[PDB]
RNA sequence: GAGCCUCGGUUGGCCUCGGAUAGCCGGUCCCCCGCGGGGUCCGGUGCGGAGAGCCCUUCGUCCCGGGAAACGGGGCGGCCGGAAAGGGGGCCGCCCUCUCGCCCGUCACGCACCGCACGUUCGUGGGGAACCUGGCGCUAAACCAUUCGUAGACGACCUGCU
RNA sequence: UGCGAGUGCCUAGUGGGCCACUUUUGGUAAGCAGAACUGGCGCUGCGGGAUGAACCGAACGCCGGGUUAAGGCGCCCGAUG
């Protein structure tokens, strides 16, 4: 009942357009691997859009001024905040339904990650255009923790390799099963394929 | 205009054995192997002809920004063929007016220090690119020699030691000093 | 690396549109995104319908690029696309997808009852090999 | 012994931008996302099931703490699976983004 | 002037019978218009510079739609144009490749607003004729003139994105 | 272990590769290196080793016969894998109970509440009050007052005091 | 072509206006000053132009259904998901 959305390969505002509308309908979505969202245009463009955002501070007291978040999770959390009516009570309860994380939490390491085809780079952006990752852009603004995240994501990536290898090991045993049992399940297979299964 | 097709054959010699993992083309032979990924060009790479006699590249429905990327695909490929068959030899002549430029290599050719350039007390430690070998020539008093297989790595190291010997806040037209490219050649001429 | 090509005589499958789900032979290419559409034995008239709403197969029948609806009909039957399409694995899963569409509640009960005893025997057999694989492992 | 109603989300009232009409409600039944396939839910009974503090009566059972506002699906809304429903009493506006039950017993097919 | 799908209209008209010439000559023109109501209105526009004629001093003799004589054969068309720029007017000669004559003029109007931002009230069409495989002066149309055509759809980017909006498979595009 | 106030949504779970998009999936591996990798070979590639998808499906019980099982369901200790915000996960049996569990057929029974709605779960759900039965383990800390003066407008801060 | 017409008494308030399509005077120009017709604000709410004198649509007793103008239909925000 809770969506887990993989952030790699998604546009910034296109994924936020899907997420923010789904949040307001009362359905919790978890956006994960937020270093993987990429932004259209060349890299040197998107740097100055967000570096000029760093210049947006109140002259008299920057401490209460705009909070320039540096982690790619909170950058994506910032762009959903502007697309939601956070000044009202409905908007504030909506942000509690949105959980946005960098890397892969061990809460969601064994959860299947959804992919939105309406926000992917390959389907939305032309192949000849340029794109800029948010993870690389955040580090050059001041996000320190890309080396810690890369070592942990590499550890998470190889940990899923044994599980997938065990999934293939069980799948060949799944496939081996109907090749010695088909002589006694041949009264149960055709009723599936005369209704459109296993074809 | 979106042209329907733009084609060019790449004739390779028999002594070069090449392969390709999709767009990542691997060129190997006598002097070693060369790997260069050909992604982000959005063109296909078809290796046709038995015993691998030619390479063919096409582009479908493109405009003039990626018609110009068709020929740079072949041009990078021939430099990989040329760098494996005959290599790349860029002789690096040094030009000085009064103070001779003393150049000597340290490990094999990797570290090159430049001293007595315009009488400067500051030595200039310049590292070469990986896979690029540097040496001093013979039968002539001062000329540097750069060896390698990749055209981009060898020539960038030549530009590194060319831009290291630059004159500051002087008349460049009079102070014709520094180390400059002399000839662009190969290890053997076949 | 491309295997499917828009060619004079390319058998194509219509994804969406008015004649959705019917086969099309290509006679001539009109523009970058338009083609001449002919539907002789597939109950489709002759018109132009764009490349967006068609998926092209790997069946080639030969005829000139300006066939007058009869030579393409003769080439459609001598190649015998209709039986060749029906034996294709791709056409097996489009009819199987639409068989699930018409599955009534009574037919769903038979599927649900047959799904249980089918799935009870493979995972019993899978577990039988799972403990058997450990026996030869040591 | 299972579920006899469809999942439906109260997305908001009938409104423009600076006006809001409270007497008509906009619904999102998950599963339907097209104009031509909203014809099944036309005229179906929709109920917003909530619970309160004090005890209220219940037909065919013991008095419990749950209350409803009964409603009816009037017509479709803007070719996206959005559909309009009219209730006997207007929604408390605290059920925006909260799931209500739309039924099937006002059936015709 | 607005547009849509275009139809070629054959409109004939003349003057009212005056005593000094009681049999005025019959004037025929080919007018491209969405419907026959504005085809008659555009007929009086084009006549109003070639001859001394107005709508109140004239009448529409017959306004009918001419149909395509070969709607299933691919043909090359050549269109002479006269449009208004931000600066003074210019003359164009364009090529289109479409099944119908009016479709090529429809393709002409949508391309003109795209390439030069010339709106439909600014383009005057003089003459559209059948053009054979030869005497075509643009490589954009000549590139389709070959007996053996062969091209794939390399970057077949898929649409139907929002039907099911959340999925697990990253969608393939190589077909 | 039972009753009793308040709070709200809730009406099955999906227990995971990476990544490419002018390209992938899964195999045996005759071949070669350290179960992993490369080459080759084989079937799909609008994906059917399909989230246009997977698993469970609950009205129940009583007899018999047929298909499945005999190595399986369930009932206490040892050994491992988990740390980025940590999993009610796997193996050994036993002193105890089955051919009931699930798939086809006979046979009946269950307030058949006589058409009328919030029915049906995660729910031993979170918080507080007091009753219950039994077992195991517990024994303080902070603040005020005083002193200090490394501190100090006052608060605050650093200290000492059987 | 459409509209029931004519006529007599008292009579408040007003006599600082402004804006806009078009014509146009002085001024380089002005959200400047001064003229003509017409329409608005003044005196007028409503939808839209994010905000708002005069812009577009449209003028108002209290409500339900339906349909639109001008605007719009990625989210805020109803609608091209």
Swiss-Prot record, chain B:
Biological process (GO), any one: cytoplasmic translation
Residue positions where N6-acetyllysine is found in the record: 121
GO MF annotation: an example: rRNA binding
Cellular-component GO terms for this entry: cytosolic large ribosomal subunit
Localization of this protein: Cytoplasm
Keywords: Acetylation, Cytoplasm, Ribonucleoprotein, Ribosomal protein
Entry superkingdom: Eukaryota
Gene3D superfamilies in UniProt: Ribosomal protein L6, alpha-beta domain (3.90.930.12)
Main location: cytoplasm
Entry keyword Acetylation: yes
Keyword Ribosomal protein: yes
InterPro entries: Ribosomal_uL6-like (IPR000702), Ribosomal_uL6-like_a/b-dom_sf (IPR036789), Ribosomal_uL6_a/b-dom (IPR020040), Ribosomal_uL6_CS2 (IPR002359)
Family that this chain belongs to: Belongs to the universal ribosomal protein uL6 family.
Summary of the function given for this chain in its UniProt record: Component of the large ribosomal subunit. The ribosome is a large ribonucleoprotein complex responsible for the synthesis of proteins in the cell.
Record's subunit section: Component of the large ribosomal subunit.
Record protein name field: Large ribosomal subunit protein uL6
UniProtKB/Swiss-Prot annotation, chain C:
Localization in the cell: Cytoplasm
Chain positions found as Phosphoserine: 138
N6-succinyllysine: residues carrying this PTM: 84
GO biological process: ribosomal large subunit biogenesis; translation
Cross-link (Glycyl lysine isopeptide (Lys-Gly) (interchain with G-Cter in SUMO2)): 123
Gene Ontology molecular functions: RNA binding; structural constituent of ribosome
Keyword Ribosomal protein found: yes
Keywords: Acetylation, Cytoplasm, Isopeptide bond, Phosphoprotein, Repeat, Ribonucleoprotein, Ribosomal protein, Ubl conjugation
Family: Belongs to the eukaryotic ribosomal protein eL14 family.
The protein's name: Large ribosomal subunit protein eL14
Source organism (scientific name): Oryctolagus cuniculus
Name of the gene encoding the protein in the UniProt record: RPL14
Residues of the full protein shown: 2 to 139 of 218
Swiss-Prot record, chain D:
InterPro entries for this protein: Ribosomal_eL33, Ribosomal_eL33_CS, Ribosomal_eL33_sf, Transl_B-barrel_sf
Superkingdom field: Eukaryota
SUPFAM superfamilies assigned to the protein according to its UniProt record, in alphabetical order: Translation proteins
Residues of the signal peptide: none
In-chain residues carrying the UniProt-annotated modification N6-succinyllysine: 62
Annotated keywords: Acetylation, Cytoplasm, Ribonucleoprotein, Ribosomal protein, RNA-binding, tRNA-binding
One Gene Ontology term, aspect cellular component: cytosolic large ribosomal subunit
Principal location listed in the UniProt entry: cytoplasm
Pfam families in alphabetical order: Ribosomal_L35Ae
Family, per entry: Belongs to the eukaryotic ribosomal protein eL33 family.
Function comment: Component of the large ribosomal subunit. The ribosome is a large ribonucleoprotein complex responsible for the synthesis of proteins in the cell. Required for the proliferation and viability of hematopoietic cells.
Assembly and interaction partners: Component of the large ribosomal subunit.
Protein's recorded name: Large ribosomal subunit protein eL33
Organism: Oryctolagus cuniculus
